[model samples]
Target: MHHHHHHFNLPPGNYKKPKLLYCSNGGHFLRILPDGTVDGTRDRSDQHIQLQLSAESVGEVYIKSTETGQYLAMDTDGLLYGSQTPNEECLFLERLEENHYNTYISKKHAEKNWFVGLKKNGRCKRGPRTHYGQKAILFLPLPVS
Candidate 1:
């Protein structure tokens, strides 16, 4: 692996400051639009934009849509999306793992060990488990610039 300051400057999704979060393994950036949708986008300029995030505490934050003022949420079946209102489903625990990357857990579905991950197509999905045979990911939020 290599280190580049430019990567942190542009960040992922081409958003400013803490608005964008990069998925290290997926090679994609997190995107939340005003239309209330959440996904991973490889393109930074094509409809994908800044997503403002706020922390409720260490390891927990509310991901808000700067475009729509909504929040992102995951359903019980590992579905990823957004909501217009804040709820328990919107709360996520940002975990700094022993592997040196970070993982996010949807508090709304904590019992099932749901983690935010990528699908085969590189889109975002809620995973049932990250410890199985299949390699899972930990999301690293862009550092303060």
Candidate 2:
């Protein structure tokens, strides 16, 4: 016997555009903008992105998608609940061959930890740098006090 999986759709008008706030450690907070262009600073050399949220109200918390390490929701009150997890794996890529003869792969593990910190700190300190993309993405949660 085969079991079927059901997908849940977010209520209409339940979601809003994300705001670009900041970028650090190769991650970005992509803010919602009417324009197709995403707002925020990015390091093409380092591969990090950041965004700001107009919806946050209090201490700051975010619901994130594990698939792309993108923020799905933000809570200014610092509440954590109703976050969904993506079953697919996130693969980090690295060019191993100059002519595309070889390639390397790695998984991103730091996204969760980094997401937690960015939600509260509103910033990330790790500057952009070159990553081979073979190593798991490191999560250095910024401490905002």
The number of the candidate with the highest lDDT is: 1
In TM-score terms, which candidate is top? 1
Q: Could you give candidate 2's per-residue lDDT for residues 29-75 as a string of tens digits?
A: 42322222222233322222332122122222243332244533223
Candidate 2 TM-score over all chains jointly:
0.19
Mark the regions of model 1 whose C-alpha exceeds 4 Å error after superposition.
Answer: 1-17, 46-49, 129-136, 143-145
- What is the C-alpha local distance difference test score of each model? 0.61, 0.26
lDDT of 1 by residue, 83-141 (tens): 88888888876655654565666776665667777654567665564442333455566
TM-score of 1: 0.72
How do the predictions measure up, each by TM-score? 0.72, 0.19
